[PDB]
C-alpha cells in the first residue's frame, strides 16, 4: 500500500556523471564507453550566447581545450565532433561502470528519472514528465546542464534527456542524448517561450486506477460516458484529447480494478465538473497527471531492476 | 528555478543490498563490511507471527539455516546475534561496495530517502518523513521488509529506518538500523494502530520560504503574530506547535528572503483560517510538510555529495 512519485535507482547514472569545462564554462557531462556527452554551448563564452555559429566556433577549438574530470582523475581528450545541440568528446579511457544503455527519443506524456548533478557531482533524484508543450516542470540550478533523464528496464539504463536551459516561466528545456531539443527551442539566449500547455488526460486516468487500487473509490460514480463526449468536457478543461490508443493501454489497469476505462472516464469528468469538494485523493488535492499507466502498474505491482 | 520532492542519490545504498532467506520467508538485507543487517522476524514462520518469542526461536537456528545471496553470489554465514528487533548476519566476505557511513535515529519531522527493494534488488526511490506519530507514509509491498531509510552528507551514508510492517490505515512502521522500532510498534501480528497525527509546523513554514525564494508571494500579508498566538491557531488546525528551536533553524531562510519568521507565521495563519482559495503553492494545492529547512536550502542552493 501507498503510492508515491518514485524515481528509478540512480546508480548506475551516478558511475556516469563529468564535468566538463572549457574556457570559463563548467558543466556536467554523460560518460558511457570512451564517449562523453555534454551540451555543445560548453564552448561558447559570455558573448558568444546571443547567437553563435556552432561550427564556427567548434572548428577553432583543439582537444586540450577542454577539461574532463571523472572524480579526482583527468580524462584525456582525443577527438570531438558535434551532433545537433550535444558535443561528443573522444576520450583514452573507456567508463568501466557503462551499464546497459540506449538512447531514447520520447512522447510528450511519458516520464523519467533526472539525475540533478553540479560539477559532475549528483545532487538529487527526482521524477519528471515530458509535458504536451514539450518543457518539464524540473528543479535546476545555475550549472546543472549535462545532467540527464532516464528510465530502466531490467538492466538497461534508456536515457532521454539531458538538461540545457530554464526559460522564463520557471521550467526546463533540453534535449535527447542525440542533441535534438524537445519542442520549439534552441540554444541561443534570444527569447523563446514555453507554449501554452494542457493536461495529460491518459495519466490523470491511470492515477485514478492507482487510487482504486489503493482503496479509495469515493470519486466513482454509476455512470458512464462515450470518448466523443468525455473528449467535449475534456476539451473545456485544458485536458488533452484520449485515443483509443490511450483506451488500450489503461486495459490492464481497467482489468484489474474491474472499472472499464469509459467508467473511470465518467468518474474524471464528474471530477472535472464539480471539483473535489475538499477532499484528496492519494493524498493529492489535486488531479496528478505526471504518472504514466506503466508507472501504476510498476509500483502498484513491485517490479525490480538488476 | 523549480521545487521537487527530490531523493538523495541511490548508488551508494543499491551496493548494499542482498537478499536473506530463512525458511519459507525471504527478505532484504543491509551488507555493510561483514555484517548483513535484516529484520529480526526472518526467522518467523506462518504461525510463528502471532506472539512470537524471539530469543528462543533463534537459539534453534544454525548459520547454514540463513541464505544470503548479493547478486547472483552465495555469501556464508559465519555467526549471527540479534538486537533488538534486527538481525545481524556475519558473513565471511566483506562487502567491496561498502561506503562511509553511520546509524542515526531521527527525530520526527526529518526526512530521508527510501530504496524500496524486493528480493535485494532496488525497485525506486523516494523521499518520506517520519511523521509525528512515528509512522511513515510509504509505498511498500509483500517482501519489501529490510529496505532502508536514509541521508547522506557529503560521502558519509547515514541509514536512520528499516521496514518491518504496514499498518491497516496503510501507513508503515518500521525501526532504526540497530533494531528500535520508531513509535510504540512491536514486530508481532497482533492489533496495533497508528495513533493520531499532526501536520508538521516548522516544514510548511520552510515550504513557504521555498515557494518565496521561487517567485511566489501571493500567500503573504502585512501582518505579523507571536508565537502563542500562533500556537493557538495551530492547535486549532492539528498543527504541531512551533518551538522557539524551530524559529531559530528558519533563521537562514527567514535572512534569505528577508521575511521574519513571525511574519510567515502570520501568513501560515491566514492560510489556514481561509484556505488557499483555489490557488496553488509551489504546484500543490494543500499545505506541504515533508520538507525540513535543511531540505529547502539543499534544493534552492545546490548541494552536491561525493
Ligand atoms: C546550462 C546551465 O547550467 C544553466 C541551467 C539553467 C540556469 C537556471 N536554471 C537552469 O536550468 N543554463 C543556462 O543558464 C542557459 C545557458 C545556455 C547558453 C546559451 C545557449 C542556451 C542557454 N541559459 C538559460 O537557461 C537562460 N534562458 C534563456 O536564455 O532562454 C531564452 C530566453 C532569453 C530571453 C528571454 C526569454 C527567453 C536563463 C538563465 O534565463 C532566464 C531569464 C530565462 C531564466
Ligand atoms: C516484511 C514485509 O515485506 C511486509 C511488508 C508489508 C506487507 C504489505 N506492505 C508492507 O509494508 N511486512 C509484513 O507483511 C508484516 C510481517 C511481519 C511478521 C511478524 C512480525 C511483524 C510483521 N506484516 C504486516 O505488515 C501486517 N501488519 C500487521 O500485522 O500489523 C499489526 C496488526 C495486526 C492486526 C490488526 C491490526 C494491526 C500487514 C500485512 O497486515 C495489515 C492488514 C495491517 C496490512
Redesign the interface.
Known amino acids: 500500500?501507498?503510492?508515491?512519485?518514485?524515481?528509478?535507482?540512480?546508480?548506475?547514472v551516478?558511475?556516469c556523471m563529468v564535468q566538463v569545462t572549457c574556457g570559463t564554462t563548467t558543466l556536467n557531462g554523460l560518460w558511457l564507453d570512451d564517449v562523453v556527452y555534454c551540451p555543445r554551448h560548453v564552448i561558447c563564452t559570455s558573448e558568444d550566447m546571443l547567437n553563435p555559429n556552432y561550427e564556427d566556433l567548434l572548428i577553432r577549438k583543439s582537444n586540450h581545450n577542454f577539461l574532463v574530470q571523472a572524480g579526482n582523475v583527468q580524462l584525456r581528450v582525443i577527438g570531438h565532433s558535434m551532433q545537433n545541440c550535444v558535443l561528443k568528446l573522444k576520450v583514452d579511457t573507456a567508463n568501466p561502470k557503462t551499464p546497459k544503455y540506449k538512447f531514447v527519443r520520447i512522447q510528450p506524456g511519458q516520464t523519467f528519472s533526472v539525475?540533478?548533478?553540479?560539477?559532475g557531482?549528483?545532487?538529487?533524484?527526482?521524477q519528471?514528465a515530458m509535458r504536451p508543450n514539450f518543457t518539464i516542470?524540473?528543479?535546476?540550478?545555475?550549472?546543472?546542464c549535462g545532467s540527464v533523464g532516464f528510465n530502466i528496464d531490467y538492466d538497461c539504463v534508456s536515457f532521454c534527456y539531458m538538461h540545457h536551459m530554464?526559460l522564463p516561466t520557471?521550467?526546463?528545456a533540453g534535449t535527447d542524448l542525440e542533441g535534438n531539443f524537445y519542442g520549439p527551442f534552441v540554444d541561443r539566449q534570444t527569447a523563446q517561450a514555453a507554449g501554452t500547455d494542457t493536461t495529460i488526460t491518459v495519466n490523470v486516468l491511470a492515477w485514478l486506477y492507482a487510487a482504486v487500487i489503493?482503496?479509495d473509490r469515493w470519486f466513482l460514480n454509476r455512470f458512464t460516458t462515450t470518448l466523443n463526449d468525455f473528449n467535449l468536457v475534456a476539451m473545456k478543461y485544458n485536458y488533452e484529447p484520449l485515443t483509443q490508443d490511450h483506451v488500450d493501454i489503461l486495459g490492464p489497469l481497467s482489468a484489474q480494478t474491474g472499472i472499464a476505462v469509459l467508467d473511470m472516464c465518467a468518474s474524471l469528468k464528474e471530477l472535472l465538473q464539480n471539483g473535489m469538494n475538499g477532499r484528496?485523493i492519494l493524498?493529492?488535492?489535486?488531479l496528478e497527471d505526471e504518472f504514466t499507466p506503466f508507472d501504476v502498474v510498476?509500483?502498484?505491482?513491485?517490479?525490480?531492476?538488476?
Chains 1, 2 share one sequence.
Open positions: 500500500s501507498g503510492f508515491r512519485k518514485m524515481a528509478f535507482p540512480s546508480g548506475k551516478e558511475g539525475l540533478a548533478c553540479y560539477n557531482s549528483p545532487s538529487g533524484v527526482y519528471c516542470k524540473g528543479s535546476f540550478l545555475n550549472g546543472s530554464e520557471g521550467v526546463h489503493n482503496g484528496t493524498g493529492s488535492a489535486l510498476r509500483q502498484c505491482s513491485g517490479v525490480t531492476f538488476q
